[PDB]
């Protein structure tokens, strides 16, 4: 028709959503959620003079964390698992290939206690 512009451009077409006909795999069809489980997030407690000095003195716990985990993931998972309020999470990748997490509890809880219930004393 009437053209304001000098150049052609492709007409807007109705682009439908992608609708599978059959579900591609079992998992898909079962609507499997890949979120990492809380207990796979926090793995192991740390016993070293360092770890302990941190538990006694700094109100901190040191745990090995699942490698692909994030800090917020650790905070949440640690609360859901241990019934504690985590004030801060810090992350290390050891050369040995693990994630150290330095966790500081709020003033509410006491690391030493969680230690005691866990069998870490």
């Amino acid at each position: 028709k009437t053209y304001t512009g000098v150049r052609f451009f492709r007409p807007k077409t109705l682009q439908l959503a992608k609708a599978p006909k059959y579900s591609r795999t079992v998992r898909a069809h079962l609507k499997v959620s890949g979120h990492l489980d809380n207990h796979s997030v926090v793995k192991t407690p740390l016993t070293t003079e360092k770890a302990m000095k941190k538990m006694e003195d700094e109100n901190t716990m040191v745990f090995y964390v699942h490698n692909r985990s994030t800090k917020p993931q650790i905070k949440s998972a640690f609360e859901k698992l241990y019934n504690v309020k985590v004030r801060s999470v810090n992350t290390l990748n050891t050369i040995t290939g693990n994630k150290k997490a330095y966790i500081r509890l709020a003033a509410d809880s006491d690391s030493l206690t969680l230690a005691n219930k866990i069998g870490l004393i």
Partner: protein
């Protein structure tokens, strides 16, 4: 403290198997914490036991879920690839028997009106 028997597991429900899974996992973590702090050989063995256990539980759960999805899709082609036959790319890519033997008209005619016969010569 006893070994886990498969059939016994296939007896229960999905809920049941799941709850048990969670329990087992919690067990494991407690146990590794055993290793780390101080621990008795009992706890060490406990570890391997519970691991294998958890595997078994999962195995069952999938057996069930699977047979379920297969059930829904029973009867239809256009199942999810998970379930579709996996043999060889070459196998599936190939022609059918229907198509292998399938024959042009003139052919069916000759096959009727001429064909091959049983004969014997005598001497």
């Amino acid at each position: 403290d006893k070994s886990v028997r498969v059939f016994k597991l296939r007896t229960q429900t999905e809920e049941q198997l799941v709850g048990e899974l969670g329990k087992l996992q919690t067990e494991l973590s407690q146990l590794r914490i055993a290793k780390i702090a101080g621990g008795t050989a009992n706890k060490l063995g406990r570890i391997g036991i519970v691991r294998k256990a958890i595997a078994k539980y999962l195995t069952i759960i999938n057996e069930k879920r699977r047979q379920a999805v297969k059930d829904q899709f029973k009867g239809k082609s256009l199942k999810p690839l998970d379930i579709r036959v996996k043999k060889t790319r070459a196998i599936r890519r190939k022609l059918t028997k229907k198509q292998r033997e399938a024959v042009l008209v003139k052919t069916q005619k000759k096959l009727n009106n001429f064909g091959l016969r049983k004969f014997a010569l005598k001497a």
